[PDB]
């Protein structure tokens, strides 16, 4: 089908406390596969996902070495943005970067993305064109000016139509048995007494996978979307996730209600209703 | 795999 | 500098079944600045080796991150988890309910 993967790096600085903290992973569609955290004793990438362990040491060798320039070069970024920013050396502040490919079911490119984020808020960005940039404030076009005398999109671009694309072909083959399998959410409906005169119905959504789920509550076939609590999906931790939807009914009209259910994995969208 | 990043802000 | 404080979630792995080993979840994601505490409570009492995911973030740049126990619930035991953050005055406590 559809398919991405994205590469999720965090340094934040912690002045008196030594080099700031630096984490990042990949993800292939929800699963993630690999890992980085500086403040490990000898800080190397290592696998989170059976068919990314038979890469071979060099792999390991090149990743590893991409991880700890990109911490290095945020170490610098970070204090930079202490100058475009006008800022103190004595807090704390947050460096975020994703970047990554989408690709469809004939495995060609469908989307690049590369974006950065300082204490929480867009900085720049490479719009889709891979081409051009958007800047979220002055300080971010200074950047803007400097990327684009380098010609970094052009390298942005030649690796996200590439290598990047190649890369998550070559994942979704090995990890075919998982990362090509939809597991489908097993449902039910609980029925829960709030007064002598109404209940909450909650329909539930477990062992799921991909993430992305649709959970509907119906009365008499209209949807009672604002009458309906969501939470957000939630992993279970084994790779799967799970949701619920809830809605509050007058007791003795639980039956007019429906909970419906789509989900990749489904042969066709399921409804169910409470059953006492 | 990852793109190294050979840029500053 | 915004900050979002963190959303909070605590169930199981797998449906609760007296007396069968399971896994105690705590689900803190939504948030901003990324430094957090997550304590999982046993009786009121902080549970030791909890393990944690990876920091990790949303399209809106907002933080996630899992907090795990093995654990084997009776009828009798209470677990809970205690986040606190900037945005939070004290720590936040939300008890596990199986139904939720
Ligand atoms: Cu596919
Ligand atoms: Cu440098």
Same mark, same amino acid.
């Given at each position: 089908g559809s398919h991405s993967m994205r590469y999720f790096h965090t340094s934040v600085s912690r002045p008196g406390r030594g080099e700031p903290r630096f984490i990042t992973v990949g993800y292939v569609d929800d699963t993630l596969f690999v890992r980085f955290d500086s403040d490990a004793a000898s800080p190397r990438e290592e696998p989170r996902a059976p068919w990314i362990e038979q890469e071979g040491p060099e792999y390991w060798d090149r990743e590893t070495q991409i991880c700890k320039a990109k911490a290095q070069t945020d170490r610098e970024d970070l204090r930079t943005l202490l100058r475009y920013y006008n800022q103190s050396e004595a807090g704390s502040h947050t460096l975020q970067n994703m970047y990554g490919c989408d690709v469809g079911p004939d495995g060609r490119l469908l989307r690049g993305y590369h974006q950065d984020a300082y204490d929480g808020k867009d900085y720049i960005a490479l719009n889709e064109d891979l081409s051009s940039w958007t800047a979220a404030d002055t300080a971010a076009q200074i950047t803007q000016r400097k990327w684009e005398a380098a010609r970094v999109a052009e390298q942005l671009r030649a690796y996200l139509e590439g290598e990047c694309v190649e890369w998550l072909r070559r994942y979704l083959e090995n990890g075919k048995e998982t990362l090509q399998r939809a597991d489908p959410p097993k449902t039910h409906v609980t029925h829960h007494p709030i007064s002598d005169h109404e209940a909450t119905l909650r329909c539930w959504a477990l /062992?799921?996978?991909?993430a992305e789920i649709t959970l509907t509550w119906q009365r008499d076939g209209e949807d009672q979307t604002q009458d309906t609590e969501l939470v957000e999906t939630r992993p279970a931790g084994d790779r799967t996730f799970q949701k619920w939807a809830a809605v509050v009914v007058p007791? /003795? $009209? $639980?039956?007019?209600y429906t909970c419906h259910v789509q989900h990749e994995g489904l042969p066709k969208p399921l409804t169910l209703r409470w059953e006492p | 795999r990852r793109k190294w990043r050979r840029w500053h802000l | 500098m915004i900050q979002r404080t963190p959303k909070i979630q605590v169930y199981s792995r797998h449906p609760a079944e007296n007396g069968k080993s399971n896994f105690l979840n705590c689900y803190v994601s939504?948030?901003?600045?990324?430094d957090i505490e997550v304590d999982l409570l046993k009786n009121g009492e902080r549970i030791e080796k909890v393990e944690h995911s990876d920091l990790s973030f949303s399209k809106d740049w907002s933080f996630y991150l899992l907090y795990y126990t093995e654990f084997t619930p009776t009828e009798k035991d209470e677990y809970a988890c205690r986040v606190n953050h900037v945005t939070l005055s004290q720590p936040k406590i939300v008890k596990w309910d199986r139904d939720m």
């Open positions: /062992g799921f996978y991909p007791s /003795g $009209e $639980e039956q007019r | - | 939504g948030f901003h600045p990324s």
